[PDB]
Amino acid sequence: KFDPSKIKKLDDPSRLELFDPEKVLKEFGLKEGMTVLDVGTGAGFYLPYLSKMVGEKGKVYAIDVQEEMVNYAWEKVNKLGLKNVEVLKSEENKIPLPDNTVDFIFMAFTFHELSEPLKFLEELKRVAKPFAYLAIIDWKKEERDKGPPPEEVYSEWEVGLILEDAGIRVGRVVEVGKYCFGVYAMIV
Numbered sequence: 150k151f152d153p154s155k156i157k158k159l160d161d162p163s164r165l166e167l168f169d170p171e172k173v174l175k176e177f178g179l180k181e182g183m184t185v186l187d188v189g190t191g192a193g194f195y196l197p198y199l200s201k202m203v204g205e206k207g208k209v210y211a212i213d214v215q216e217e218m219v220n221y222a223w224e225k226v227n228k229l230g231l232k233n234v235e236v237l238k239s240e241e242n243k244i245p246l247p248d249n250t251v252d253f254i255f256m257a258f259t260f261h262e263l264s265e266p267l268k269f270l271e272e273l274k275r276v277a278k279p280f281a282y283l284a285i286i287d288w289k290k291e292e293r294d295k296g297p298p299p300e301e302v303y304s305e306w307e308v309g310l311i312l313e314d315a316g317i318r319v320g321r322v323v324e325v326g327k328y329c330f331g332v333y334a335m336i337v
């Protein structure tokens with residue numbers, strides 16, 4: 150799990166150097182009116198983005214298993230005036246949402262942190278509508294002059310395999326700005 154006392158590392162405007170937030174989202178299919186789930190919301194860094202992209206009509210559920218991250222992200226939305234965002238306290242494999250409520254699922258740098266992936270994936274489909282798109286973004290499994298140790302992350306290869314076990318269908322796997330990759334998946 151990410152360390153709560155290092156949270157400022159998640160609220161660093163220099164993260165933009167990894168990839169353009171709305172360029173990537175728009176390309177992965179996030180649209181106005183869509184209800185999006187932000188799994189490891191952390192500091193709520195990408196929240197201003199997701200918020201903007203769904204607009205007045207959409208909604209953003211920002212979850213996180215850690216209470217400190219939840220309250221930090223919350224103060225963030227209020228500080229910035231993000232009215233369509235709902236920050237919630239999550240449990241490892243349980244999302245506090247009713248079935249078929251999400252259109253877009255965004256998982257930024259949080260997949261490799263899941264205790265029990267395929268079990269979390271099942272919980273994910275539940276809250277996910279029959280349609281639903283899954284956008285998973287993470288670090289490459291090599292060595293980089295900017296990201297965490299490789300044994301600490303999955304490689305695009307492993308991830309998309311797990312998704313397969315879980316039943317999710319992967320359609321695209323593209324590099325994301327020199328340090329990360331991204332995966333396009335649709336929930337069945």
Ligand SMILES: C[S@@+](CC[C@H](N)C(=O)[O-])C[C@H]1O[C@@H](n2cnc3c(N)ncnc32)[C@H](O)[C@@H]1O
Nearest residue numbers: 151159189191194213214215241257258259262
């Ligand atoms: C790399 S950090 C996220 C940083 C954030 N995505 C950003 O872009 O600034 C990963 C977050 O995942 C959360 N996390 C770990 N397991 C989780 C789970 N099963 N459900 C929800 N959040 C989880 C942690 O509390 C941690 O803050």
